[PDB]
Write a protein that binds this ligand. Structure first.
Ligand SMILES: Nc1cccc2c(=O)[nH]c(-c3ccc(Cl)cc3)cc12
Ligand SMILES: [Zn+2]
Length: 209
């Protein structure tokens, strides 16, 4: 069902996605261990992910959520990094894509910081790095992130020092940073239907000069 349509770099939609990718890079407390050392990315391709079935799966759930939340889906655009990216874009998000050991329980995790999702591209803690060089900080191998439309609904605020169910009466969990000054928020949904994998970004991390 899925088709991938390339966006021209001249297209304002390309530029706005690249800008969110680039401007949400931060330094991480692991000093680059999981995701590599970089301040910016070389964006190689942005593709729009088009799947009618999956989109309708998403908009149905979004409607259910907003109807439970005074007509407010609380929709965000958030990054997602995973070794299952290629599965996700064909079959949609489901329980196989959950971070089982996550600080907010077994759910599917999204980030405001692109560099945060970048840590999971090769797996939990960056795994053993790129399959070709076994290097978590590879500057050569091509990486992929998703920029996703996500329905938060009523989100449970977890103040935090940084498949299951949502907490009763909520539709998601918000991981609010309570120590790392510059960290952006992280979010968890417990229904895969509450996200749609809208953009596939192919990129490299870049070596600082
Ligand atoms: N803990 C996280 C916080 C923010 C963003 C992400 C994210 O983008 N991906 C992930 C992730 C994805 C797949 C698997 Cl198998 C494990 C973790 C976590 C994650
Ligand atoms: Zn490599």
């Amino acid at each position: 069902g899925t088709i991938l349509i390339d966006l021209s770099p001249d297209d304002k939609e390309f530029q706005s996605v690249e800008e969110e990718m680039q401007s949400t890079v931060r330094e991480h407390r692991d000093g680059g261990h999981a995701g590599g050392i970089f301040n910016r990315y070389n964006i190689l391709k942005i593709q729009k992910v088009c799947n009618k079935k999956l989109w309708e799966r998403y908009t149905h759930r979004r409607k259910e959520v907003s109807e439970e939340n005074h007509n407010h889906a609380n929709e965000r655009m958030l990054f997602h990094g995973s070794p299952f990216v290629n599965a996700i874009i064909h079959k949609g998000f489901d329980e196989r894509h959950a971070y089982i050991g996550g600080m907010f329980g077994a759910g599917i995790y999204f980030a405001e910081n692109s560099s945060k999702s970048n840590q999971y591209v090769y797996g939990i803690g960056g795994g053993t790095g790129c399959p070709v060089h076994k290097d978590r900080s590879c500057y050569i191998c091509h990486r992929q992130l998703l920029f996703c439309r996500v329905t938060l609904g009523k989100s449970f605020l977890q103040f935090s020092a940084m498949m299951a169910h949502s907490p009763p009466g909520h539709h998601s969990v918000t991981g609010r940073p309570s120590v790392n000054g510059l960290a952006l928020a992280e979010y968890v949904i417990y229904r895969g239907e509450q996200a749609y994998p809208e953009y596939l970004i192919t990129y490299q991390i870049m070596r600082p000069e």
